[PDB]
C-alpha cells in the first residue's frame, strides 16, 4: 500500500496521486517488478495454436506451450511447427515428440 521511492511492488500498480499501491486483478493482469506504472499489464491468452502451461497471477504472466503434435525448443523464439510422425526411409526413432522437441532419429 505504501510506495517506496515512488515505485510499487510486483503484483501492484501506483495510484494517480502517488500515495497508494493497488493490487493487480488476479487472472486479468500482472506486474513482475518494482514499477511506477498507473496500470498493470494484460495477461497473455493462449488462444488456439497454444495451450496454457501455467496461469496468470498478479506477479507472473501466463505461460503457454504448444499443443501435443507441435513443438518449440527451450528458449526458441521461432514459431511453433509440426512434429514428424516417423523417421525418413532408413532410420529409427530414438526419442518421442513433446511440446519441447521433435522426434529424434538415427541411421543404421
Amino acid at each position, epitope marked *: 500500500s505504501s510506495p517506496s521511492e*515512488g515505485l510499487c511492488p510486483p503484483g501492484h500498480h501506483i495510484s*494517480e*496521486d502517488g500515495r497508494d499501491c493497488i493490487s493487480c486483478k488476479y487472472g486479468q493482469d500482472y506486474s513482475t*517488478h518494482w*514499477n511506477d506504472l*498507473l496500470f498493470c499489464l494484460r495477461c497473455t491468452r493462449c488462444d488456439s495454436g497454444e495451450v496454457e502451461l501455467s496461469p496468470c497471477t498478479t506477479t507472473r504472466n501466463t505461460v503457454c506451450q504448444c499443443e501435443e503434435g507441435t513443438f518449440r525448443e527451450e528458449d*526458441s*523464439p521461432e514459431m511453433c511447427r509440426k512434429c514428424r510422425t516417423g523417421c525418413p526411409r532408413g532410420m529409427v526413432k530414438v526419442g518421442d515428440c513433446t511440446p519441447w522437441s521433435d522426434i529424434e532419429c538415427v541411421h543404421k
Partner: antibody
Amino acid sequence: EVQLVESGGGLVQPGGSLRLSCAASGFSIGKSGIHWVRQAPGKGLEWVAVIYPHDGNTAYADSVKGRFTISADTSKNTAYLQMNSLRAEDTAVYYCARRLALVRMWMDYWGQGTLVTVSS
Amino acid sequence: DIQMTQSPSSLSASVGDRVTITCRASQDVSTAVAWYQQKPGKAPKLLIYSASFLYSGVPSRFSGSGSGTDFTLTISSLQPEDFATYYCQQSYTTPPTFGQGTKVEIKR
C-alpha cells in the same frame, strides 16, 4: 479493452485555430492522463503535450508552448488540444496516447491519429 | 534538450536473423528509455519501457538493454511481423525525445 479515438483534424490557414479531441474508453483519464504526439508526413515522432486531469497538471513541447493548450473533461472522459496561432510546420498526424506511468512519459493505446494541415 | 541518435537508419534482414538496433542519448538518461514499433499507416505501439521491461503481449524474442548513454533493442530471431520502423524514446526529463527511427526491411 482500452481505446482512444482522435477527432477534429482538418486543413486551416496559418494564424488559424483547431481543437482536437480524444475520447477515451475502458479506463479513467482521471486516474491517469493523456499525451499528444505528432508525426509530420515522412518524419518521426515529436511529443507535444500531456495532461494529468487529477491535478490539472500540464506540460508542453517548446515548439508548442503558449500557442497550444491541453485540457480535459473527466465527466466526458475526453481530452482536448486547443491549437492556436497555427504554423505550416505544425502539419502532422496528431495521435493521443494514454499516460501509462506516474512519472515517465511511457505511452500505450495510441489512437489511429488525426491529420492536421496548415496551409494558405 | 536531449538528442537520441538511432543507428542504423535502415537495415535489410531475413526471417530468422539476429537484429540489433542501438540508440545513443547525448546525456545520461539512466534506464529511462522505451522502444516503439510502427508499421505504415498505423500508430506506434509500446514494446519496452524502462530500458529492458516488456510491455504486455510483446513476444520474448524482443529484448531491451542499456543504462546511462547506450541502449539496445535486440530481436533474437526476426519474424514476418517484425519488419517495421523502431523508435527509441527517453523520458528522463521533460520533454521526452525520440530517435529518428530504424526501418527494418526484408532481404530477398
